[PDB]
């Protein structure tokens, strides 16, 4: 399915309907300095590592389309609950 790249909607921050550009959200790299990373490094030793030797699970048949809406006026972005589609495109 297609969603427009830019459309007029409500900005929660400036509290008005302005034009907003839609951007697909890319998952970031997990920090190596997080508390879970430090706990993993601390619990690594000889033997089973507990939950840190878990293999990542499976996948749902379709993933949600992670979208982020940036107000064109205040340049702040908000992200809303998103739909779930096999094929996603931007209308231009």
């Amino acid at each position: 399915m297609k969603i427009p790249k830019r459309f007029r909607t409500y900005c929660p921050f400036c509290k008005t309907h302005n034009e907003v550009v839609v951007e697909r959200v890319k998952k970031g790299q997990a920090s190596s300095m997080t508390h879970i990373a430090r706990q993993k490094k601390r619990q690594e030793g000889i033997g089973n590592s507990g939950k840190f030797s878990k293999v990542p699970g499976g996948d749902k048949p379709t993933k949600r389309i992670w979208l982020r809406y940036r107000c064109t006026v205040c340049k702040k972005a908000h992200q809303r609950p998103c739909f779930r589609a096999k094929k996603f495109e931007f209308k231009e």
């Binding site: 030793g45 000889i46 033997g47 089973n48």
Partner: protein, 196 residues
């Protein structure tokens, strides 16, 4: 400055591989390797180290060089059921340090004496060498000596085996006070060995 020659011995042994001790080390480990486990010596190798650790030139004070192997606790793989955590032993070093191992071997070799202290005197890729000072509580010189006659007491016997030397206290975790010594003083066994 007016420094004692003990100060020069200290400076020479501060960075031994950058001083003449490195060459001396080269000739000297050749002789030490041919020797056995526990060798009595006439004089300490590092006189200033011995004197600061308590060595005196008097009757009843013996100095020995002990040879100890390198690496951790050479441990046997269990042959019965274990947890995965308790199955691996190769990476498990001990809780007994090499210096205290040398002290205890010297104490075993010399049943009538008591270990006072010991210091590092060399090492190679396979061995470390320590010099252990021992005291004779039943020698009249030591009995007269009021800075050593505490060793004639019933509680001063078995010091190295009961962990009462400086290396033993360091291994017991009583080298410091305050935070981190909650489970170490007054003894490891007093808190179910949860410290260390």
């Amino acid at each position: 400055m007016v420094k004692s020659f003990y100060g020069y011995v200290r400076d020479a042994w501060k960075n031994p591989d950058e001083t003449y001790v490195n060459e001396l080390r080269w000739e000297r480990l050749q002789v030490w390797r041919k020797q056995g486990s526990v060798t009595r010596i006439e004089r300490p190798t590092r006189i200033d180290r011995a004197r600061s650790l308590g060595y005196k030139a008097k009757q009843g004070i013996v100095v020995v060089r002990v040879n100890v192997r390198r690496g951790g606790l050479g441990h046997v793989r269990p042959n019965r059921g274990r947890r995965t955590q308790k199955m691996g032993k190769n990476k498990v070093s001990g809780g007994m340090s090499i210096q205290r191992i040398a002290e205890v071997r010297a104490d075993r070799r010399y049943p009538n004496l008591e270990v006072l202290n010991s210091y590092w005197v060399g090492e190679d890729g396979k061995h470390k060498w320590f010099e252990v000072i021992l005291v004779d509580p039943h020698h009249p010189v030591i009995k007269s000596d009021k800075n050593l006659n505490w060793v004639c007491d019933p509680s001063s016997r078995g010091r190295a085996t009961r962990g009462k030397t400086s290396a033993g206290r360091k291994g017991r975790g009583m080298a410091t006070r305050g935070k981190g010594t909650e489970k170490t003083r007054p003894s490891i066994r007093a808190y179910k060995s949860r410290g260390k």
